[PDB]
Ligand binder design. Sequence first.
Ligand code: LN2
Ligand code: LN2
Lengths: 162, 163
Amino acid sequence: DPREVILCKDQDGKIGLRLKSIDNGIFVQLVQANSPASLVGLRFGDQVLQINGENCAGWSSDKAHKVLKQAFGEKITMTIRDRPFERTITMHKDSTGHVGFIFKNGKITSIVKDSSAARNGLLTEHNICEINGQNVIGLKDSQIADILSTSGTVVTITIMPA
Amino acid sequence: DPREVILCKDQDGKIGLRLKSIDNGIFVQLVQANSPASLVGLRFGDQVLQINGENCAGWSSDKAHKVLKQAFGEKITMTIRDRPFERTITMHKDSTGHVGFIFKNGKITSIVKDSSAARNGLLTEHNICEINGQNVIGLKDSQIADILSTSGTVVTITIMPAF
Ligand SMILES: CC(=O)c1ccc(F)c(-c2ccc(C[C@@H](C(=O)N[C@@H](C)C(=O)O)N3Cc4ccccc4C3=O)cc2)c1
Ligand SMILES: CC(=O)c1ccc(F)c(-c2ccc(C[C@@H](C(=O)N[C@@H](C)C(=O)O)N3Cc4ccccc4C3=O)cc2)c1
C-alpha cells in the first residue's frame, strides 16, 4: 500500500535516482550509493505514483528526468509502492557449490535440469536484485558470482521480472 | 510458500486445466468451471513447480499437457506456488462512473490522464484477473464492462503482467 517519502536534495541538486518508464508507470531503475534516495530506503523496482503531488502515469523516462531536475532542494515528496514485482526464492548449494542457474548482466537466463533452482521454480528473464540481502543491482556478473560463492548453503535470492 | 495439491481426474480423465510456459516455468492459464482443478483451488496465474514428483522447469506447455495426459491414474499430484505475479489495485469511480482505463481482450491498454487509475498507478500490458472478487478470466470485454457498470464506487482489480 503506497507510502509517502520525503527526500532532500544534496550539495548541488541530485537525488541520486534514475527513473524509467515501464507499462505507463514510473519505476526506480538505479539508486546511487550514499545518496538521499538510498538514505530513505529507495530500491530498484519501486514504483513512483506521485512526484510533488503530481501523477507519473504516462510519463516518458525523459519527462520523469526533467520533472526531477526542476524540483526545489529542501523538499521532494514522492508516493512510492515498495517493489510491486518483488519475489524471494531460497536455494541450497550442491556438492559443487552450485544452486542451479545461469545469469548474464544480472538477469537469469537458464535453469539447470535436476537442480535446486528447478525444484524451487526459479524463473528466467528476471533480474537478481538481492542475494542474501545485499544489493547486487549495477554489479558486474563476476562480482555477483563472487557474492554467490562467498555465501552459505542457503541462498536467499530476490528476483523481479525484466 | 509452496503447497501440495492432489487432483482427482473426472470420468473423462480431464482435470479442467490449461497450462502455459512463461520464463522457463509452468503456469495455470485457464481453470474450467466446476472441475477437479477448480475444486482444489487452482487459479489463473498459479505456478506449477512439480507434476507427479517431476520438476516443470524448462518444460513447454505441450510437454506439460503431454505429461498430464499420460499416466492415467485417478490422482495427479502437483506442487503449486500461489499466483506469484498477483497485484491488487483499488480505484474509485469519478462523477461519471469511470476509474480511468481502457481494456481490449481483458488487458489494460491505456490510462486516462488525471484519473483514479492514474492516481493509483494502474499499469498497461496487464491482464485483469478479478474485479471485486469476480473471476473475469475467459469473459468477453462486453461481460467485463457489465461487471464494471454494476459495481459500486470502489473498484478493486487483481492484475498480472500479460507477458
Ligand atoms: C545441479 C546443479 O546445480 C548444477 C549442475 C551442473 C552445473 F554445471 C551447474 C552450474 C555450473 C556453473 C554455473 C555458472 C554460474 C553460477 O555459478 N551461477 C550460480 C548462481 C550457481 O548456479 O550456483 N555463473 C557464474 C557466472 C559468472 C559470470 C557470468 C555468468 C555466470 C554464471 O552463469 C552454473 C551452474 C549446476
Ligand atoms: C477521469 C476519468 O476516469 C475519465 C474521464 C473521461 C473519460 F472519457 C473516461 C473513460 C470513459 C470511458 C471509458 C471506456 C472503458 C471503461 O468504461 N473502462 C472502465 C474500466 C472505467 O475506466 O471505468 N471501456 C468500456 C469497454 C467496453 C468494452 C470494451 C472495452 C471497454 C473500455 O475500454 C474509459 C475511460 C474516464
